[PDB]
Design a protein around this ligand. Sequence first.
Ligand SMILES: [Ca+2]
Ligand SMILES: [Ca+2]
Ligand SMILES: [Ca+2]
Length: 260
Amino acid sequence: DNPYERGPDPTEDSIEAIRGPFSVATERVSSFASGFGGGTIYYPRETDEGTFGAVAVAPGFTASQGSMSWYGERVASQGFIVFTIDTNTRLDQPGQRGRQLLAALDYLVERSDRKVRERLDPNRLAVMGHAMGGGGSLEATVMRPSLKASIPLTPWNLDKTWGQVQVPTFIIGAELDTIAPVSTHAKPFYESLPSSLPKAYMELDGATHFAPNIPNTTIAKYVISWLKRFVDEDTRYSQFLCPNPTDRAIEEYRSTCPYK
Ligand SMILES: [Ca+2]
Ligand SMILES: [Ca+2]
Ligand SMILES: [Ca+2]
């Protein structure tokens, strides 16, 4: 058996749910934390199924953790520790955001409150972020190839080459994005990721740049599935990723299914 499986067997409704099987508590981390601007940790309360993997979540240029706060309970309740962080400054660039995502994960492993630490599997970590924070998700995987998953949301980065990434990466784009256009950011990132890498591109039909800051069942259900598959190695969730999703909200989905 897979020792990392958590919660009951999934359905399309269970990954679409506003609330998963686990109840959620929070721990606040002040900006005096080393290497990033603090944040909020969301974690599952029930301990009887074992420890959980974690994902650090970055906001974009000009923004703060509040723009990302809806991922907190919705994703943690599925069986994850979720760390929505603030950056050192609102003007930090993607490389900097990448370093701060890693500093946030290292805080979780090394210095977080006992309540979080006792629930955390330090071996199974992921990154996610919006816009320049999504560019930071990419940056982080080059900086630390041992990460289990990466989800750049409407990502922004001047660096278009990602041929060395080894971390399973799920890029979500917004069709009508004028700030980080899919034509000049999301799509060239996806095309540059190795063809041998477990990866997926999902473009949201008619969506604007700020769609990742607005609760979105299409985003949520496949974010949860991606994290389950790669942070937990949970092949119960392969069914939602392969074959490719056909939801009406999706303008395009491409992938490197199967994920062996
Ligand atoms: Ca700090
Ligand atoms: Ca590069
Ligand atoms: Ca369209």
